[PDB]
């Protein structure tokens, strides 16, 4: 099984699954799309 290696960049974003990613590249490798900006909350 292959997997993407997350880069060393900062200012993460929120995918359309409702989870945090270091960039759009990572959400895409999980089958998610970018939705909003910043680190996403746990749901609180």
Curated annotation (Swiss-Prot):
What Pfam family is a match, any one? Kazal_1
Q: Which SUPFAM superfamilies match?
A: Kazal-type serine protease inhibitors
What are the site positions for Reactive bond (tryptase)? 8-9
**Disulfide topology:** 4-29, 6-25, 14-40
Q: Where is the Kazal-like domain?
A: 1-42
Keyword match Disulfide bond = yes
InterPro entries in alphabetical order:
Kazal_dom, Kazal_dom_sf, Serpin
Which SMART domains has this protein been placed in? Answer: KAZAL
Note the Gene3D superfamilies from the entry: 3.30.60.30
Summary of the function given for this chain in its UniProt record: Acts as an inhibitor of human tryptase, trypsin and chymotrypsin. Probably acts to block host defense mechanisms.
Name listed for the protein in its UniProt record: Leech-derived tryptase inhibitor C
The organism encoding this protein is Hirudo medicinalis
